[PDB]
Every structure is written in structure tokens, then in C-alpha cells.
Amino acid sequence: GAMAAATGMTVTPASTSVVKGQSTTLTVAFQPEGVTDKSFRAVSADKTKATVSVSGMTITVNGVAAGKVNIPVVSGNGEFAAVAEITVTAS
Numbered sequence: 303g304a305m306a307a308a309t310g311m312t313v314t315p316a317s318t319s320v321v322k323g324q325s326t327t328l329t330v331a332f333q334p335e336g337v338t339d340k341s342f343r344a345v346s347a348d349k350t351k352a353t354v355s356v357s358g359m360t361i362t363v364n365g366v367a368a369g370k371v372n373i374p375v376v377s378g379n380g381e382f383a384a385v386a387e388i389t390v391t392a393s
Contacts, residue, residue, distance in 0.1 A: 307341045307378020308334035315373065315386030316363065325353075325364035326388055328373065332359075342377035352388060365390030 310333045316326035332342070344356035346363075352371035353364040363373060368390045375384035 305341055305378060306334075306337050306339075307381035308332050308337045308339075310334060311342060311377050311382035311384070313375050313384035313386075315361075315384070316388060317386060319389035319391060320363075320365040321391050322365060322368065322393060325362050328356075328361040328363065328386055330356075330359040330361070330375070330384075342375060342382065344373060344375055347372035347374055352390060363388045368392035 312331040315328040318326065320326055344354060344361040346352060346354040348371050351367040351369045353366060354373055355362050365388065370387055370389050373386045377383060
């Protein structure tokens with residue numbers, strides 16, 4: 303409850319398309335300069351046509367079904383955030 307997210311988080315997703323059955327990887331960066339603590343996290347916006355798994359500042363996105371799936375990001379209590387999109391080809 304009582305914590306601090308950070309003082310500057312730079313998330314750089316894949317932002318691109320993918321083939322059915324494939325998956326991409328998103329990168330996350332943080333430069334608080336005083337906090338030094340992973341208080342942020344990732345999550346799928348739909349999770350109905352793609353999976354997501356964050357780990358070590360690396361979030362892998364799988365294209366279960368064809369379509370565009372967004373993947374937002376929350377830091378602390380809403381301090382910082384990010385947005386990404388992964389297209390899935392029916393083929």
C-alpha cells in the first residue's frame with residue numbers, strides 16, 4: 303500500500319505483427335535514481351487472443367489467435383505506465 307513506483311520508467315515493447323503460434327518479447331526499463339525496486343508489472347488488455355508473461359523486465363507475448371492485442375503496463379499505484387500492441391496473423 304505505502305510504496306513508491308519510481309521516478310522514470312521507459313518501456314519499449316515489440317510493436318509489430320506475429321505469425322500464428324509465434325510470440326514476441328517486450329523490454330522494460332526503469333531509472334528512478336533512488337528507488338531501485340521492481341514495483342511495476344505487465345498484463346494483457348484482452349487475453350482472449352494472446353498470452354502475456356512478464357519476467358526480468360521481459361514480457362513475452364504469444365499470438366493465440368489472429369487479431370490485435372494490446373498490453374498495458376502499471377507501475378506502483380499508477381505512477382508510470384506503458385502501452386503496446388501485437389498483431390496476430392491468421393496464418
